[PDB]
Structure formats: structure tokens, C-alpha cells
Design a protein around this ligand. Structure first.
Ligand SMILES: O=C(c1ccc(OCCN2CCCCC2)cc1)c1c(-c2ccc(O)cc2)sc2cc(O)ccc12
Ligand SMILES: O=C(c1ccc(OCCN2CCCCC2)cc1)c1c(-c2ccc(O)cc2)sc2cc(O)ccc12
Lengths: 225, 223
């Protein structure tokens, strides 16, 4: 785990990338609040399966005990679906690419009980990713970080060194791209601060989701794996 | 102006803006914390106005920044002042609570535990006051940041990163240790946001835009 070079880390992660799934094939439009919720729910659930496989490929992840793994996923799943959303939405200004066959815009997002707020936040995040020209290899570094860090609250120590290893890898990608040492640290901070907002959106979303078992589910899923 | 400060000028500006540590004036426990929070707010606005870049913002923007960061600000200060009081939260010098005392409020334990773990992690990394003050300003500037305006703030933020690294180098960490520590501290900003988000839920379960607007307004007519 802590034996991978910057480059080995990066390729490992890129390989672990989950596939991009599709929305239940053309149901009916315009959707309703429940119909859209249903497409979104079906999608998320199917994506949750791949997430488990990806998690299991995240350096450090499978060194933890099954129950700690469940804890990290329990807490990060929504952040992780969201960073994937934002990233695949980058080249669709004004719209979110929940799936290739389900590209919604601000107005569609209002069909559901106050997701406008989040949708907008989400919109702004890919926008900033676009603005910063976020790169694939950095994106995968940010996801792994979200996975290890949202739930981190000799094992504690282990995760902190994997986390330090991903920072190393993020700065290594920046240097190799020619950034100045000053630009390196600035970009590193611009990225980690975006995790603050990502977290923010998942807490808002979790609230919106519950206004409208996971442990056991993930345990079952993680153990089955 | 803000963008022209050196790393060391930034730090002292900041150290200078520190609010005073207030005391508990003593829904009893909830009373105590509401009174404390309320009086702290008043100084927060004041310190806000001394964060480089902050006053270059429109009044609306200033209120949006505090509207979203106030609780993260209160918490990071609680955390910091709790550091050397393992097992307890030092809400005030005359109001040091423990895990169990936090239990007397429904839902407070989980946040309380979270608050405890954050000060623990601050202890663990030997967070320095200079670094602390740096992290508070980033919180103010970042939690509500979501067009030469957007850009200003982002530059102020870059300068804070610069200052953060400066203190680290100055302290003698290696280049590698610098980005590592920088990253360790900024991931703690997600947990802080997390506690704030959870804390507002809890606050509103129990039972401000203009409040700050007036406050930010009144500050220009204050002696
Ligand atoms: O709409 C969803 C969403 C819907 C249902 C979900 O979960 C339903 C239940 N499921 C139970 C087993 C554990 C996995 C979750 C999760 C996300 C998505 C998001 C969301 C956005 C705004 C908002 O206000 C609330 C949520 S973002 C997102 C990205 C995706 O790839 C998929 C769904 C989503
Ligand atoms: O208890 C408080 C607190 C209590 C009442 C508050 O609100 C007072 C209402 N007021 C209205 C106008 C805006 C300013 C707040 C805010 C914080 C504090 C915290 C808290 C912790 C756990 C939790 O679940 C909820 C809150 S943390 C904290 C730090 C302080 O310096 C002061 C109070 C606090």
C-alpha cells in the first residue's frame, strides 16, 4: 500500500475506476417527483455496488477490518456519488450528468422536494472543477481521500500515512505537470477546500433524502465481495 | 491591500484580530451556551472585519460568509481552547464540560464526541496558534464562497495557503512535510463543516441574515 510509487498509485486508482452506469432506460417524461426519485434511487443503488468494488481497490482500504470499511463507506457514499456526478458533469455547463441517458438541468431538479439548493451547489462544483481544469488523475486522488477521510473520526495511524501518501501523489502530479512549488501548494489547497463543499452537499443531501440499514447492507455487500 | 501582505504580515494581522476568550455568564445549559454564543458572535463580526480581504467584499457578501461560517467559527475556537483539556470541552474558562455533561442535551453527544476528537487531533499534530488563526480565516472565506469578486477571495485564500506553508518552512518542516501538514489541516476543515452541519440540524430541531446585516452595518457606527 505504502510501497507504491506516485505513478503506481495513480494507475492503480485509474484502473479501479467504476464504470459509468445508465438510468433505467427511458421510462416516461416529463417525470414526476416520485418517478425521478425512482430513477435516481435505482441508479445510486446500482452505482453503490461498483463503489464497493472500487473501495476494495483503494490503497489502505482492505488493510482495515470489515467493520471499519463499513464505517468509511457508510459515511462517504453520498460524497462519492457526488464527486463522480460533479466530475462527469464538468463538460455540460448548466446541467448534471446523472447518467448518459439522464442529463438534467436546474429546472428539472425542482421536480423534487428542494433539491434545487443542492443541484445548484453541485452545479457550481463541476463548474469550479472546469474552471480549475481538474484532471482525471487528481479526481481519483480526491475520491480516495474522501473515502479514507470522511469517517476517520496503529490503525488511525495507518490511514493517516495512506492519506499522506495521496497528498504526495497529488503534489507529484502537479510538479510533473510543471507547477511551481508555490503553485503546487496553492492547487493542493484549492482542491482540499473543495472537499469541504462536497461534504457540505452530502450532509445537505442526506437531510433531503431522509425528509423524503445501510450499515448492514454494506456489511453484507462488503463481506460478499 | 490584502493581496500585498507578506506571510509574516498576514500572521500578525490575524493574531491581532483574535477575539477575546469570553466567560459564561453564570435550557440552563442550553441557556448558558446560547448566551455565550450570542456574545461571541458580537466579537466574531469584529474579528471578521480584520480578516484580510473580508472588508473588500460587499456588505451582502460579508453577511453571506458569516451566515454560513459562524458555527464553524465557534466550533474551531472551542476545539482550539479545548486542546489541553483532554476529555472535556472548554466552552468558557468558567464552563468546562465533559462527555456526560453534554448528554443533558438531546443529540449533543455525537457532536460533542466529534468536537472532542477534533481537539484531540489538534493536540496530536501540535496545531500552532499561527496555523489556527490561518485556518479560521480560510473557514470564513471558504464556507460560503459558492466575477472579479469570486477571484479576489480565491487570491486571499492562496495567500493564506502561502502563509500556512511559510509558517511550516519557518518551523523547519521539509518540503514534503509541508504539503503533508497542509493537507492534514485542510481535511480537518471537512470535519469542522460536518460538525457545523450536524450542529445546525440539532440547533433547529430544538427551537440571522439580517441579524448580521445590522451587526455588519452597526460596526461602522461603533466606537
Ligand atoms: O438523487 C440522488 C440519490 C437518490 C437516492 C439515493 O439513495 C437511495 C437509497 N440507497 C439505499 C442503499 C444505500 C445507497 C442509497 C442516493 C442518491 C443523487 C444525488 C442527490 C443530489 C441532490 C440532492 O438534493 C439529493 C441527492 S447526487 C447523485 C449522484 C449519483 O451518481 C446518483 C444519485 C445521486
Ligand atoms: O451550544 C452551542 C451553541 C448554542 C446555541 C447557539 O445559538 C445561539 C443562537 N444564536 C442566534 C443568532 C446567531 C448566533 C447564535 C449556538 C451554539 C455551541 C456548540 C454546539 C455543540 C454541539 C451541538 O450539538 C450544538 C452546538 S459549540 C459552541 C462553541 C461556542 O463558543 C459557543 C457555543 C457553542
Amino acid at each position: 500500500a505504502l510501497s507504491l510509487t506516485a505513478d503506481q498509485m495513480v494507475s492503480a486508482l485509474l484502473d479501479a475506476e467504476p464504470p459509468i452506469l445508465y438510468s433505467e432506460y427511458d421510462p416516461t417524461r416529463p417525470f414526476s417527483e416520485a418517478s425521478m426519485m425512482g430513477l435516481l434511487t435505482n441508479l445510486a443503488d446500482r452505482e453503490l455496488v461498483h463503489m464497493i468494488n472500487w473501495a476494495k481497490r483503494v490503497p489502505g482500504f482492505v488493510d482495515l477490518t470489515l467493520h471499519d470499511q463499513v464505517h468509511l463507506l457508510e459515511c462517504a457514499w453520498l460524497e462519492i456519488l457526488m464527486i463522480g456526478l460533479v466530475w462527469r458533469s464538468m463538460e455540460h455547463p448548466g446541467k448534471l450528468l446523472f447518467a448518459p441517458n439522464l442529463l438534467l438541468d436546474r429546472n428539472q431538479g425542482k421536480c423534487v422536494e428542494g433539491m434545487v439548493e443542492i443541484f445548484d451547489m453541485l452545479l457550481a462544483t463541476s463548474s469550479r472543477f472546469r474552471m480549475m481544469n481538474l484532471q482525471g488523475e487528481e479526481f481519483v486522488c480526491l475520491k480516495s481521500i474522501i473515502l479514507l477521510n470522511s469517517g476517520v473520526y496503529e490503525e488511525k495511524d495507518h490511514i493517516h500515512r495512506v492519506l499522506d501518501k495521496i497528498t504526495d501523489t497529488l503534489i507529484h502530479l502537479m510538479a510533473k505537470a510543471g507547477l511551481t512549488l508555490q503553485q503546487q501548494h496553492q492547487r493542493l489547497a484549492q482542491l482540499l477546500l473543495i472537499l469541504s463543499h462536497i461534504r457540505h452537499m452530502s450532509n445537505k443531501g442526506m437531510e433531503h433524502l431522509y425528509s423524503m440499514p445501510l450499515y448492514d447492507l454494506l456489511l453484507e455487500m462488503l463481506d460478499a465481495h
